[PDB]
Write a protein that binds this ligand. Structure first.
Ligand SMILES: CCCOc1ccc(C(=O)NS(=O)(=O)c2ccccc2)cc1CNC(=O)c1ccc(-c2ncccn2)cc1
Ligand SMILES: CCCOc1ccc(C(=O)NS(=O)(=O)c2ccccc2)cc1CNC(=O)c1ccc(-c2ncccn2)cc1
Lengths: 256, 264
């Protein structure tokens, strides 16, 4: 029966590679120094950064915020495509699929964002750039505390030393969460997640035999992700409440 | 197997201490709730006059109606902190930790445990109180004057889902131990020795659920995911309390609970 769990793990790994360009293994090689990325450590390297690498992604703090928004919008489509490759997912009630993606994408965004972070900064622009933790923290209120909680999570998350093959299954487990509000048919969702869970459990045991209770430790990080997401939502609200300089083009805002 | 043997020993030790620290077990609570018996029948409180006669029939160990009920839950919570603290000390390695970290684990751990153990005392219709002598309906509690009317409801919602896991006391003893030894608590000085203990606890829990619920696929994984639900409930609860102290300036909060809420 473990032959089907290994097949599922492989299936998911291949799909994850196809859907997500910048893998963790690639990002790690770049971060550690093993064709260096442009570094943004202050206002002037910022200015030159957009001059050089030029991101589709007026005020500096606002321009950075909006850039992260553009990337998350792309990430949602990459995630959506990955979800469709998870066995059983497309066979679910279409409203439920929509629901699972709607509530799942932020958790996955921050999970995968950790792959792009170390304690010193984050890879941006498909790894063409590196923007420092301190520079981000130096953005005026309340933008200077937007990325920081994510860095704190990443550092803890990255200590688990997961690889791409591990994360492919973990991500799929997040998507198939039966507790999302408004779901109409919870049974096949938890039935699929139960199977992904077994796959992840086995994967972690074979891949990290020396890492005791890694499975448990990973599931515990769910708490952390969700806390990060609700916290993020709340900051977004303050940006909405205050901040008049956030208004984009009518059509542009529709996209977000 | 010699590994497995040490894990079973740890499970037995924990279940034993749990029975010793917590006077009203889930097993007892379920016996009262399912109302099979004639000696263990609770007096039911479902409205005001019912509550009034409750005060007579029920010996409570410890003004306005919502307030007397609030102060009632506050007393019980404090009693629970004491019970949990006593249980915590029995967990191997706990008392050997940095004193400041022992306190930190308790501070952030006790509410998650209170609402875990509170689920043992609930069904969809209400909650056992005063050592199972009383039963207060969910509707009566929901009908309370705002904002007291919605203090208890999120706990009920959690409990019915949690209860569907069908855990028994021997399972819960270990799960509660795992909650206490949480290495991700804010302000922990020495994370590693906590994590090492928690690691051992997680092994014990995992084996326990497999032996006790062999037909329950991924119960271990499902139980751990409930820790997310617990965090949420505690967060909501604390926010609710901050609302109260501003609206109800004549309402007193117990100092121990206050110290727990402080910078939570
Ligand atoms: C692979 C998953 C997606 O990557 C994500 C996803 C979400 C987020 C995110 O939620 N950001 S955020 O919390 O909304 C934020 C707000 C204000 C300042 C910093 C961050 C960020 C990135 C990472 N950020 C970037 O890639 C990025 C950052 C800055 C720019 C940028 N900087 C200067 C000018 C224009 N763009 C472009 C991209
Ligand atoms: C280990 C089990 C823990 O039990 C707990 C723990 C926490 C809480 C809790 O946090 N409650 S609460 O959310 O603060 C709340 C306050 C007011 C109305 C509804 C809810 C409640 C109970 C349950 N409540 C009671 O046991 C209780 C309820 C009512 C009375 C009471 N009622 C009327 C008059 C006097 N006492 C006494 C105890």
């Amino acid at each position: 029966e473990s032959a089907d769990l290994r097949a599922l793990a492989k299936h998911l790994y291949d799909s994850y590679i196809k859907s997500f360009p910048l893998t963790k293994a690639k990002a790690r090689a770049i971060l550690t120094g093993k064709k260096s990325p442009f570094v943004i450590y202050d206002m002037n390297s910022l200015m030159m950064g957009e001059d050089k690498i030029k991101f589709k992604h007026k005020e500096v703090a606002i321009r950075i915020f909006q850039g992260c928004q553009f990337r998350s919008v792309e990430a949602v489509q990459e995630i959506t495509e990955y979800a469709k490759s998870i066995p059983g997912f497309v066979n679910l009630d279409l409203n439920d699929q929509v629901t699972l993606l709607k509530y799942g994408v932020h958790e996955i965004i921050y999970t995968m964002l950790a792959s792009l972070m170390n304690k010193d900064g984050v890879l941006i622009s498909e790894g063409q750039g590196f923007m420092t933790r301190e520079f981000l923290k130096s953005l005026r209120k309340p933008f200077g505390d937007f990325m920081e909680p994510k860095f704190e999570f990443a550092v803890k998350f990255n200590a688990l030393e997961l690889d791409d093959s591990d994360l492919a299954i973990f991500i799929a487990v997040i998507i198939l969460s039966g507790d999302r509000p408004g779901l109409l048919n919870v049974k096949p969702i938890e039935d699929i997640q139960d199977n992904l869970l077994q796959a992840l459990e086995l994967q972690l045991k074979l891949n990290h035999p020396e890492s005791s209770q890694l499975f448990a430790k990973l599931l515990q990080k769910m708490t952390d992700l969700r806390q990060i997401v609700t916290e993020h939502v709340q900051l977004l609200q303050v940006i909405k409440k205050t901040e008049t300089d956030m208004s984009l083009h009518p059509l542009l805002q529709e996209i977000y």
